Design an enzyme around this catalytic site. Structure first.
Site, short mmCIF file in Angstrom:
data_model
loop_
_atom_site.label_atom_id
_atom_site.label_comp_id
_atom_site.label_asym_id
_atom_site.label_seq_id
_atom_site.Cartn_x
_atom_site.Cartn_y
_atom_site.Cartn_z
N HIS A 83 37.14 38.37 62.83
CA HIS A 83 37.62 39.61 62.25
C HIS A 83 38.64 40.23 63.20
O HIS A 83 38.76 39.80 64.34
CB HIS A 83 36.46 40.60 62.04
CG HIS A 83 35.54 40.24 60.92
ND1 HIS A 83 35.03 41.18 60.05
CD2 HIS A 83 35.03 39.05 60.52
CE1 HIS A 83 34.24 40.59 59.17
NE2 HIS A 83 34.23 39.30 59.43
C1 LIG Z 1 45.83 34.54 47.75
C2 LIG Z 1 44.96 33.92 48.82
N1 LIG Z 1 43.66 33.53 48.27
C3 LIG Z 1 43.53 32.95 46.94
C4 LIG Z 1 43.07 33.98 45.94
C5 LIG Z 1 42.48 33.73 49.09
C6 LIG Z 1 42.78 32.89 50.32
S1 LIG Z 1 42.94 33.95 51.75
O1 LIG Z 1 43.81 33.10 53.02
O2 LIG Z 1 43.76 35.44 51.31
C7 LIG Z 1 41.30 34.35 52.31
C8 LIG Z 1 40.65 35.25 51.28
C9 LIG Z 1 39.95 36.35 52.08
N2 LIG Z 1 39.94 35.85 53.46
C10 LIG Z 1 38.62 35.20 53.54
O3 LIG Z 1 38.26 34.52 54.70
C11 LIG Z 1 37.84 35.30 52.25
C12 LIG Z 1 38.25 35.73 50.83
O4 LIG Z 1 37.03 36.11 50.17
C13 LIG Z 1 36.00 35.96 51.15
N3 LIG Z 1 36.46 35.54 52.43
C14 LIG Z 1 34.52 36.25 51.04
C15 LIG Z 1 34.29 36.43 52.54
O5 LIG Z 1 34.46 35.29 53.39
C16 LIG Z 1 33.96 37.77 53.20
C17 LIG Z 1 34.18 37.67 54.71
O6 LIG Z 1 33.42 38.67 55.40
C18 LIG Z 1 35.66 37.89 55.01
C19 LIG Z 1 36.11 37.40 56.38
C20 LIG Z 1 35.13 36.77 57.37
C21 LIG Z 1 37.45 37.94 56.87
C22 LIG Z 1 37.77 37.62 58.32
C23 LIG Z 1 39.14 38.22 58.58
N4 LIG Z 1 39.99 37.72 57.53
C24 LIG Z 1 41.42 37.60 57.71
O7 LIG Z 1 41.98 38.08 58.93
C25 LIG Z 1 42.29 37.63 56.47
C26 LIG Z 1 43.62 36.98 56.80
C27 LIG Z 1 44.47 37.03 55.54
C28 LIG Z 1 45.91 37.32 55.95
C29 LIG Z 1 44.31 35.83 54.57
C30 LIG Z 1 45.64 35.09 54.35
C31 LIG Z 1 46.44 35.63 53.16
C32 LIG Z 1 46.50 35.03 55.61
O8 LIG Z 1 43.39 34.80 54.98
C33 LIG Z 1 41.96 34.92 54.81
O9 LIG Z 1 41.13 34.67 55.96
C34 LIG Z 1 41.32 35.31 53.47
#
Ligand SMILES: CCN(CC)CCS(=O)(=O)[C@@H]1CCN2C(=O)c3coc(n3)CC(=O)C[C@H](O)/C=C(C)/C=C/CNC(=O)/C=C/[C@@H](C)[C@@H](C(C)C)OC(=O)[C@@H]12
Ligand SMILES: CCN(CC)CCS(=O)(=O)[C@@H]1CCN2C(=O)c3coc(n3)CC(=O)C[C@H](O)/C=C(C)/C=C/CNC(=O)/C=C/[C@@H](C)[C@@H](C(C)C)OC(=O)[C@@H]12
Ligand SMILES: CCN(CC)CCS(=O)(=O)[C@@H]1CCN2C(=O)c3coc(n3)CC(=O)C[C@H](O)/C=C(C)/C=C/CNC(=O)/C=C/[C@@H](C)[C@@H](C(C)C)OC(=O)[C@@H]12
Lengths: 204, 204, 204
Positions: free
Chosen positions: B82
């Protein structure tokens, strides 16, 4: 602006992320804050992650707002405790006359309540033992087993879990704990989300 | 002589043992050596064990040759991190205008690649944290949680995992390291298997 | 008086609590005492919790009487150990010619038998490694990973597990280990259950 704080599934098209408050509103002795969410492992609801919680023991569970609870996290309440001034065998539970041997009010010590602060990040498959407290802005490493309290804004992990490092300096923690951005009106929060993400909220 | 290094299930009458290379040759950013195998827990294929691996993060997974991976072993990539410079709440992920608060790649912690060496034995239900490096000929006790690097030919265990002791003397390790029997032609290995099993190859 | 020591499911209206002895009566090299019970995690029977137990190695499993085993507890026997005088790769298992490389009787050291004493409480999800010995009246914290022996009437937890506290003073332990209330006729036990529960049975 933002998700509805009272919707069980905030993100339609994703039945894994769930808002805890709307789901645990029916549970007794469980106070949960808004925006805190749970990441399901196999489709199960967070209520299945709370174990050994009996109304007769009167212990309570408190979770703040804006928390991140990873998949598999488990909270152990006081129902797991056995009698310990002698044998640990639960004769009473087997019945057939052994029910005479039920523990009296003062032969089942209680470790206390379980309170998780605000803006807390709990990793995957973490286990919370009875009576522990976790301060605001704390981060618990995945696969930890927490038996003791954790100070605000600390990095803890391991089994048993131990404090690894301070996230920020004292003065910064002191200010953060004093402004409590999580209690602001939703509209004010929206106009500061960025300042909250970069920690510059302590300046303005 | 010996099993086919590129058969999904090298042992007739055993739908549990799998050769990882053939299984994971389709994955992006995953480099696996030959003869390394996985002991299935319930029938699942090793790919289901690689978690939080996203192409956008550019982190890569490397596993050597002749490795023994116990059932239930999981490898956590950088996708679980995160944002840490402020609140750990993933606003961006909920939509409704919050998507604008999406972090740049520069604002996400990157712990590096995950590298497993050659001839490594990983115990059952071991969890590997992001950016970890494990040296050749190392042994990881079962149920361990590895958060820091492990030197070559070391026995580690615990949670957090810590080094327990050197398998052999330094001179022996130094000799093994610049011999790399795992890189020899399969026909040469076959005529030295017994010598490799008892450490006498250092006498050639 | 009390439950039938020979009933697989002693408690009417709860198909979770099960008596170990009757269930493991079929297993070779497994001896279990009366009244010791298991609290099922998902309806699975305790036999499914004993892993890597091979008759050819001849290692035995011994559990005393009046024990309390938490859900998810697993016992790991000697079938998990790899050869360690050289490479840990099990060439022999893959066959196709490599079957000739099968360890000699003395190339697979063994850590001994696994003996759990009387009146012991083992917490939820605890893992027991090969060869460990747990003395009478010992308490093992949930989620522990026991690699070394635990003395009588001691409290241990962690991964690896460590002795945390001595339940009573020496004289008490000495007296308790001398009378062995668990070996008395069930009738005599029934008339002292309360005395056993508060440790007053040492002063009779
Ligand atoms: C358009 C892109 N799509 C297709 C629709 C989704 C792919 S994604 O690369 O935006 C992905 C979705 C949310 N993130 C998750 O890990 C994820 C999405 O839903 C969930 N996780 C459910 C969970 O896993 C909840 C979890 O608590 C979320 C976590 C552990 C988030 C950790 C921090 N996340 C990131 O820093 C988000 C970075 C963004 C920029 C996106 C990309 C667009 C770059 O990547 C993800 O990790 C993104
Ligand atoms: C009429 C009341 N009902 C509805 C039929 C049952 C609810 S209960 O409050 O009597 C509950 C049942 C047994 N205890 C269990 O935790 C429990 C029951 O079965 C099982 N556990 C299976 C196991 O969880 C085995 C486990 O080893 C038992 C444990 C860990 C016992 C720890 C010590 N237990 C207590 O001190 C018992 C307190 C009594 C008084 C009862 C209430 C009636 C007060 O509460 C329970 O914990 C009680
Ligand atoms: C003809 C004999 N048969 C019938 C066909 C097989 C029985 S066995 O005694 O050869 C058994 C098979 C492989 N070993 C396994 O533990 C086992 C087999 O497949 C699997 N395990 C899948 C896994 O469990 C992978 C695991 O990583 C392998 C382990 C943990 C190996 C630990 C070290 N093993 C031994 O030292 C092997 C000893 C040999 C000599 C054989 C006997 C022939 C003596 O016993 C086994 O443990 C053997």
């Amino acid at each position: 602006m933002g998700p509805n704080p009272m919707k069980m599934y905030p993100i339609e098209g994703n039945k894994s992320v769930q808002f805890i408050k709307p789901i645990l509103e029916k549970l007794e002795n469980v106070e949960v804050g808004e925006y805190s969410y749970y990441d399901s492992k196999n489709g199960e609801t967070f209520d299945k992650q709370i174990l050994y919680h009996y109304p007769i023991l009167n212990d309570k569970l408190k979770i703040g707002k804006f928390c991140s609870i990873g998949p598999g996290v488990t909270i152990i309440m006081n129902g797991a405790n056995h009698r310990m001034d002698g044998s640990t065998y639960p004769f009473n539970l087997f019945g057939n006359g052994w029910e005479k041997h039920m523990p009296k009010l003062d032969q089942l010590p209680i470790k206390g309540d379980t309170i998780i602060g605000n803006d807390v990040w709990i990793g995957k498959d973490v286990v919370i033992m009875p009576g522990v407290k976790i301060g605001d802005g704390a981060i618990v490493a995945a696969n930890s087993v927490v038996v003791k309290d954790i100070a605000p804004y600390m990095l803890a992990g391991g089994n048993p879990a131990n404090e690894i490092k301070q996230r920020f300096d004292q003065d910064t923690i002191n200010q953060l704990l004093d402004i409590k951005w999580w209690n602001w009106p939703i509209d004010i929060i929206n106009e500061n989300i960025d300042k909250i993400l970069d920690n510059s909220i302590i300046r303005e």
